[PDB]
Design a binder for this molecule. Structure first.
Ligand SMILES: CC(C)(C)n1nc(-c2cccc3ccccc23)c2c(N)ncnc21
Length: 448
């Protein structure tokens, strides 16, 4: 009945437990969902561990190459990393056939360069697993072992397990949410905003975090606290996870530290000078994915723009600062006015009637699209804030950006429809962007 560690974990508190990948643990108390009390069968030490860093000792989830329910697309973003040798692989759940699996493998060809080939793994009614019926296997493990020795009609022999990064724990530690101010050390100033600052820091002397501070008089702690309850419930690979808070003014919001910074600066950077269309579209697709989750949760972002998107490794983009805008108490800002309100991203009905919805976020996404295709250039280049809303009201829309294909401009124009309900859904935008470049090639290589 033992569990095994899937990744290394460094202790963060006095009551938690460090372990290395592969270490056998006993779960001596599993009552709480996200932190379990465990006990190393190697060291004898006890302490709390994040439940997502372990799997049952003989399970399929224990397999280092088994990635579970991961999209085909997300699967490709990992496999295509330039460091991966050919034959890098992983196994995941097939999306299109329930109860089937999929072996994804990285390959190189002169026509295509670097690419990913997928093989659907079907399980027989008699019990076996196979890619080609010619050769079956009693488990996924055995399939993987055989194909690590002989290619046998796959593109390449299985060589290296697809590497991944450690997943985020749920919270910084068990029961940690409203944390004391003195547990944070501010180290490097990352940014400065209209209502506060962002800092790289350390929680509890151990854990690297980012800390956003709010000026006193920005919002009430009581309102901030009720909302933060809603925000901690939002969990998605394309949303910046909020870790903990300090509710008393000056308010702190503690979150994952995204070393690569905002999408906006990454776009303007030497980092952005040579980004090609396919990458811009893929970043757009992820943001739409995060927003599509917001959309399924019936939440509203309210401040969506390139500045509030954060970048990670492999061109990962995550939606940040969601919901907070609603709580800004500043007089001018509540009236959708003043040098702090992002009018250039705001749908006309939201600015005029304070009508903020997922549809006015769709409009902001259209604006964000023009940032992605113009290296972070400010929207409405020849206009000042105080003259945008009236232009937009009279039906003015930004023209197709230089070098932007009309098709993506047309998408932007759909996002900027006068009637909010005529605007597309984030679900539509996500699919449209993910499938922007049509491949003739087959979804799965033939079993043959
Ligand atoms: C680029 C910039 C300085 C604006 N930045 N901003 C954040 C950040 C954005 C939204 C909410 C947060 C909540 C707590 C901590 C940081 C953030 C952020 C981050 N997490 N990591 C790195 N840079 C960040």
């Amino acid at each position: 009945t033992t569990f095994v560690a899937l990744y290394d974990y460094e202790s963060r508190t006095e009551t938690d437990l460090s372990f290395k990948k592969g270490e056998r643990l006993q779960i001596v108390n599993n009552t709480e969902g996200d932190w379990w009390l465990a006990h190393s069968l190697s060291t004898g030490q006890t302490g709390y561990i994040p439940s997502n860093y372990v799997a049952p000792s003989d399970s399929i989830q224990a397999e280092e190459w088994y990635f579970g329910k991961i999209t085909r697309r997300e699967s490709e973003r990992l496999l295509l990393n330039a460091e991966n040798p050919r034959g890098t692989f992983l196994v995941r759940e097939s999306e299109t056939t329930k109860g089937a699996y999929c072996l994804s493998v990285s390959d190189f060809d002169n026509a295509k360069g670097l690419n990913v080939k997928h093989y659907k793994i079907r399980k027989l009614d008699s019990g076996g697993f196979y890619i080609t019926s010619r050769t079956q296997f009693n488990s996924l493990q055995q399939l993987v072992a055989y194909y690590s020795k002989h290619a046998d009609g796959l593109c390449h022999r299985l060589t290296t397990v697809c590497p991944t990064s450690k997943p985020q724990t749920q919270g910084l530690a068990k029961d940690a949410w409203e944390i004391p101010r003195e547990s944070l050390r501010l180290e490097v100033k990352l940014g400065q905003g209209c209502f506060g600052e962002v800092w790289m820091g350390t929680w509890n002397g151990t854990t690297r975090v980012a800390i956003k501070t709010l000026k006193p008089g920005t919002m009430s702690p009581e309102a901030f606290l009720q909302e933060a309850q809603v925000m901690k419930k939002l969990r998605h690979e394309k949303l910046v996870q909020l870790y903990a808070v300090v509710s008393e003014e000056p308010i702190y919001i503690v979150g994952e530290y995204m070393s690569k910074g905002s999408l906006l600066d990454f776009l303007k950077g030497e980092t952005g000078k040579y980004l090609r269309l396919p990458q811009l579209v893929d970043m757009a697709a992820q943001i739409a994915s995060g927003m599509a989750y917001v959309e399924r949760m019936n939440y509203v972002h309210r401040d969506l723009r390139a500045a509030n998107i954060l970048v990670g490794e492999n061109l990962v983009c995550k939606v940040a600062d969601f919901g907070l805008a609603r709580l800004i108490e500043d007089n001018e800002y509540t009236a959708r006015q003043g040098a702090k309100f992002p009018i250039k991203w705001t749908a006309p009905e939201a600015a005029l009637y304070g009508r903020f919805t997922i549809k006015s976020d769709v409009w902001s996404f259209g604006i964000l699209l023009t940032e992605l295709t113009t290296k972070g250039r400010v929207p409405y280049p020849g206009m000042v804030n105080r003259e945008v809303l009236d232009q937009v009201e009279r039906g003015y829309r930004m023209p197709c950006p230089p070098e932007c294909p009309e098709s993506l401009h047309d998408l932007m124009c759909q996002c900027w429809r006068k009637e909010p309900e005529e605007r597309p859904t984030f679900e539509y935008l996500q699919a449209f962007l993910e499938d922007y470049f049509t491949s003739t090639e087959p979804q799965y290589q033939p079993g043959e």
